[PDB]
Symmetry: C3
Subunit: 87 residues, 3 copies
Protein backbone atom coordinates (compact mmCIF):
# COMPACT_ATOMS: atom_id res chain seq x y z
CA UNK A 1 0.00 0.00 0.00
CA UNK A 2 1.41 3.38 -1.02
CA UNK A 3 0.00 6.96 -0.67
CA UNK A 4 0.32 10.48 -1.99
CA UNK A 5 -1.03 13.47 -0.13
CA UNK A 6 -1.90 16.97 -1.26
CA UNK A 7 -3.56 19.97 0.39
CA UNK A 8 -4.86 23.38 -0.51
CA UNK A 9 -6.55 26.49 0.81
CA UNK A 10 -6.93 27.68 4.37
CA UNK A 11 -9.38 25.12 5.74
CA UNK A 12 -7.54 23.21 4.41
CA UNK A 13 -8.76 20.67 1.99
CA UNK A 14 -6.66 17.51 1.84
CA UNK A 15 -6.61 14.62 -0.59
CA UNK A 16 -4.86 11.30 0.05
CA UNK A 17 -4.47 8.87 -2.81
CA UNK A 18 -3.83 5.23 -1.94
CA UNK A 19 -2.47 2.61 -4.36
CA UNK A 20 -3.29 -0.96 -3.32
CA UNK A 21 -3.67 -4.07 -5.50
CA UNK A 22 -3.31 -2.01 -8.70
CA UNK A 23 -6.29 0.32 -7.80
CA UNK A 24 -5.83 3.92 -6.66
CA UNK A 25 -8.59 5.38 -4.42
CA UNK A 26 -9.06 8.73 -2.83
CA UNK A 27 -9.95 9.96 0.67
CA UNK A 28 -10.92 13.63 1.06
CA UNK A 29 -11.15 16.15 3.88
CA UNK A 30 -12.87 19.50 3.32
CA UNK A 31 -13.09 20.72 6.96
CA UNK A 32 -15.42 18.15 8.47
CA UNK A 33 -15.40 14.32 8.16
CA UNK A 34 -13.28 12.20 5.85
CA UNK A 35 -15.14 10.81 2.80
CA UNK A 36 -14.30 8.61 -0.16
CA UNK A 37 -13.71 10.78 -3.26
CA UNK A 38 -14.72 10.37 -6.87
CA UNK A 39 -11.19 9.32 -8.02
CA UNK A 40 -10.92 5.67 -9.03
CA UNK A 41 -8.24 4.54 -11.48
CA UNK A 42 -5.73 1.82 -12.07
CA UNK A 43 -2.32 2.06 -10.53
CA UNK A 44 0.33 0.43 -8.31
CA UNK A 45 2.12 3.71 -7.60
CA UNK A 46 0.78 7.28 -7.24
CA UNK A 47 2.05 10.86 -6.89
CA UNK A 48 -0.03 14.00 -6.96
CA UNK A 49 0.18 17.76 -7.04
CA UNK A 50 -2.33 20.56 -7.07
CA UNK A 51 -2.75 24.28 -7.59
CA UNK A 52 -5.46 26.93 -7.17
CA UNK A 53 -6.68 29.36 -9.80
CA UNK A 54 -8.74 31.71 -7.74
CA UNK A 55 -11.39 29.64 -6.07
CA UNK A 56 -10.88 26.58 -8.34
CA UNK A 57 -8.66 23.64 -7.43
CA UNK A 58 -6.79 21.73 -10.11
CA UNK A 59 -5.31 18.34 -9.29
CA UNK A 60 -2.97 16.14 -11.29
CA UNK A 61 -2.56 12.44 -10.23
CA UNK A 62 0.21 10.33 -11.83
CA UNK A 63 -0.96 6.68 -11.70
CA UNK A 64 1.78 4.14 -12.63
CA UNK A 65 1.24 0.49 -13.40
CA UNK A 66 3.79 -1.81 -15.04
CA UNK A 67 6.11 0.60 -16.74
CA UNK A 68 3.48 3.15 -17.65
CA UNK A 69 2.31 6.44 -16.00
CA UNK A 70 -1.11 7.93 -16.79
CA UNK A 71 -1.97 11.51 -15.73
CA UNK A 72 -5.48 12.11 -14.45
CA UNK A 73 -6.83 15.65 -14.24
CA UNK A 74 -9.34 17.34 -11.96
CA UNK A 75 -10.31 20.83 -13.15
CA UNK A 76 -13.81 21.01 -11.58
CA UNK A 77 -15.89 18.79 -13.91
CA UNK A 78 -14.69 15.24 -13.45
CA UNK A 79 -11.53 13.26 -13.83
CA UNK A 80 -10.03 13.31 -17.33
CA UNK A 81 -7.02 11.76 -18.91
CA UNK A 82 -4.14 14.26 -19.25
CA UNK A 83 -1.52 14.74 -22.01
CA UNK A 84 1.47 13.57 -19.93
CA UNK A 85 3.68 10.94 -21.42
CA UNK A 86 6.83 9.55 -19.82
CA UNK A 87 10.32 8.94 -21.15
Amino acid sequence: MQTAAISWGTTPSIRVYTANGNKITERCYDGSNWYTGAFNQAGDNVSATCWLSGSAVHIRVYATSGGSTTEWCWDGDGWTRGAYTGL
Copy 2:
Protein backbone atom coordinates in the same frame (compact mmCIF):
# COMPACT_ATOMS: atom_id res chain seq x y z
CA MET B 1 13.89 3.00 1.51
CA GLN B 2 11.31 5.62 0.69
CA THR B 3 11.01 9.40 1.43
CA ALA B 4 8.56 12.28 1.43
CA ALA B 5 9.49 15.98 1.30
CA ILE B 6 7.60 19.19 2.19
CA SER B 7 8.66 22.82 2.49
CA TRP B 8 7.18 26.11 3.61
CA GLY B 9 7.99 29.80 4.28
CA THR B 10 10.48 32.14 2.62
CA THR B 11 13.64 30.54 4.15
CA PRO B 12 12.30 27.90 3.41
CA SER B 13 11.83 25.25 6.07
CA ILE B 14 12.04 21.68 4.76
CA ARG B 15 11.05 18.35 6.25
CA VAL B 16 12.12 15.05 4.81
CA TYR B 17 10.41 11.88 6.07
CA THR B 18 12.15 8.55 5.54
CA ALA B 19 10.61 5.11 5.81
CA ASN B 20 13.12 2.37 6.44
CA GLY B 21 12.70 -0.82 8.46
CA ASN B 22 9.10 0.17 9.17
CA LYS B 23 10.15 3.27 11.10
CA ILE B 24 9.72 6.80 9.81
CA THR B 25 12.12 9.46 10.92
CA GLU B 26 12.38 13.17 10.20
CA ARG B 27 15.24 15.45 9.08
CA CYS B 28 14.62 19.20 9.21
CA TYR B 29 15.99 22.40 7.80
CA ASP B 30 15.10 25.80 9.23
CA GLY B 31 17.77 27.79 7.39
CA SER B 32 20.88 26.53 9.19
CA ASN B 33 21.85 22.85 9.87
CA TRP B 34 19.97 19.69 9.00
CA TYR B 35 18.77 18.03 12.17
CA THR B 36 16.77 15.07 13.30
CA GLY B 37 13.21 16.14 14.15
CA ALA B 38 10.70 15.24 16.85
CA PHE B 39 8.72 13.00 14.48
CA ASN B 40 8.80 9.29 14.62
CA GLN B 41 6.26 6.58 14.26
CA ALA B 42 5.92 3.22 12.59
CA GLY B 43 5.48 3.02 8.83
CA ASP B 44 7.12 1.58 5.72
CA ASN B 45 5.56 4.00 3.25
CA VAL B 46 5.16 7.75 3.84
CA SER B 47 3.55 10.80 2.28
CA ALA B 48 3.19 14.28 3.67
CA THR B 49 1.67 17.67 3.10
CA CYS B 50 1.60 20.96 4.96
CA TRP B 51 0.11 24.43 5.05
CA LEU B 52 0.50 27.68 6.96
CA SER B 53 -1.90 29.76 9.02
CA GLY B 54 0.87 32.43 9.29
CA SER B 55 1.69 32.15 12.32
CA ALA B 56 1.90 28.35 12.66
CA VAL B 57 2.94 25.49 10.39
CA HIS B 58 0.64 22.52 10.06
CA ILE B 59 1.97 19.15 8.84
CA ARG B 60 0.19 15.96 8.09
CA VAL B 61 2.13 12.75 7.68
CA TYR B 62 0.55 9.61 6.30
CA ALA B 63 2.29 6.51 7.63
CA THR B 64 1.31 3.25 6.04
CA SER B 65 2.19 -0.02 7.78
CA GLY B 66 0.85 -2.97 5.90
CA GLY B 67 -2.65 -2.25 4.70
CA SER B 68 -3.32 0.60 7.17
CA THR B 69 -2.62 4.35 6.84
CA THR B 70 -2.30 6.52 9.96
CA GLU B 71 -2.33 10.24 9.86
CA TRP B 72 -0.03 12.14 12.23
CA CYS B 73 -0.55 15.83 12.84
CA TRP B 74 1.76 18.75 13.69
CA ASP B 75 -0.11 21.87 14.59
CA GLY B 76 2.61 23.74 16.39
CA ASP B 77 2.96 21.94 19.72
CA GLY B 78 3.47 18.18 19.30
CA TRP B 79 2.52 15.25 17.05
CA THR B 80 -1.06 14.06 17.52
CA ARG B 81 -3.04 11.33 15.78
CA GLY B 82 -5.36 12.55 13.03
CA ALA B 83 -8.97 11.80 12.21
CA TYR B 84 -8.03 10.13 8.86
CA THR B 85 -9.20 6.64 8.18
CA GLY B 86 -9.04 4.70 4.91
CA LEU B 87 -11.70 3.15 2.68
Copy 3:
Protein backbone atom coordinates in the same frame (compact mmCIF):
# COMPACT_ATOMS: atom_id res chain seq x y z
CA MET C 1 8.36 2.51 -11.40
CA GLN C 2 7.75 5.26 -8.82
CA THR C 3 7.04 8.97 -9.37
CA ALA C 4 7.01 12.27 -7.53
CA ALA C 5 5.17 15.34 -8.78
CA ILE C 6 5.54 19.10 -8.01
CA SER C 7 3.95 22.19 -9.51
CA TRP C 8 4.24 25.96 -9.17
CA GLY C 9 2.72 29.22 -10.36
CA THR C 10 -0.53 29.65 -12.26
CA THR C 11 0.20 28.29 -15.76
CA PRO C 12 1.09 25.92 -13.97
CA SER C 13 4.58 24.44 -14.36
CA ILE C 14 4.76 20.75 -13.39
CA ARG C 15 7.70 18.46 -12.90
CA VAL C 16 7.24 14.71 -12.60
CA TYR C 17 10.25 12.64 -11.44
CA THR C 18 10.27 8.92 -12.23
CA ALA C 19 12.53 6.27 -10.67
CA ASN C 20 12.79 3.30 -13.00
CA GLY C 21 15.54 0.82 -13.73
CA ASN C 22 17.46 2.25 -10.81
CA LYS C 23 17.62 5.80 -12.33
CA ILE C 24 15.49 8.93 -11.88
CA THR C 25 14.54 11.10 -14.83
CA GLU C 26 12.32 14.16 -15.16
CA ARG C 27 9.38 15.14 -17.38
CA CYS C 28 8.49 18.83 -17.54
CA TYR C 29 5.46 20.92 -18.42
CA ASP C 30 5.71 24.70 -18.74
CA GLY C 31 2.34 25.36 -20.39
CA SER C 32 2.58 23.61 -23.80
CA ASN C 33 4.17 20.21 -24.49
CA TRP C 34 5.83 17.81 -22.13
CA TYR C 35 9.62 17.46 -22.39
CA THR C 36 12.44 15.51 -20.77
CA GLY C 37 14.29 17.60 -18.25
CA ALA C 38 17.94 17.96 -17.24
CA PHE C 39 17.52 16.11 -13.94
CA ASN C 40 19.22 12.75 -14.19
CA GLN C 41 20.57 10.92 -11.18
CA ALA C 42 20.86 7.44 -9.76
CA GLY C 43 18.09 6.16 -7.50
CA ASP C 44 15.34 3.66 -6.82
CA ASN C 45 13.10 6.24 -5.01
CA VAL C 46 12.40 9.94 -5.40
CA SER C 47 10.53 12.69 -3.53
CA ALA C 48 10.53 16.35 -4.21
CA THR C 49 9.33 19.80 -3.09
CA CYS C 50 9.54 23.34 -4.43
CA TRP C 51 8.86 26.99 -3.66
CA LEU C 52 8.91 30.32 -5.47
CA SER C 53 10.97 33.38 -4.89
CA GLY C 54 8.68 35.75 -6.76
CA SER C 55 8.65 34.04 -10.19
CA ALA C 56 11.92 32.12 -9.75
CA VAL C 57 11.45 28.41 -8.90
CA HIS C 58 13.52 26.45 -6.39
CA ILE C 59 13.33 22.66 -6.40
CA ARG C 60 14.75 20.10 -3.99
CA VAL C 61 14.81 16.48 -5.17
CA TYR C 62 15.65 13.68 -2.72
CA ALA C 63 17.06 10.70 -4.62
CA THR C 64 17.52 7.54 -2.64
CA SER C 65 19.77 4.65 -3.62
CA GLY C 66 20.63 1.94 -1.05
CA GLY C 67 20.27 3.29 2.50
CA SER C 68 21.34 6.75 1.38
CA THR C 69 19.55 9.82 0.11
CA THR C 70 21.14 12.61 -1.93
CA GLU C 71 19.43 16.04 -2.22
CA TRP C 72 19.58 17.82 -5.58
CA CYS C 73 19.01 21.59 -5.89
CA TRP C 74 17.65 23.71 -8.74
CA ASP C 75 17.81 27.46 -8.08
CA GLY C 76 17.81 28.85 -11.62
CA ASP C 77 21.27 27.73 -12.82
CA GLY C 78 21.56 23.94 -13.09
CA TRP C 79 21.39 21.10 -10.65
CA THR C 80 23.71 21.06 -7.67
CA ARG C 81 24.14 18.52 -4.89
CA GLY C 82 22.67 19.79 -1.63
CA ALA C 83 23.66 19.66 2.02
CA TYR C 84 21.06 17.03 3.04
CA THR C 85 22.40 14.15 5.14
CA GLY C 86 20.18 11.37 6.44
CA LEU C 87 20.28 9.68 9.83
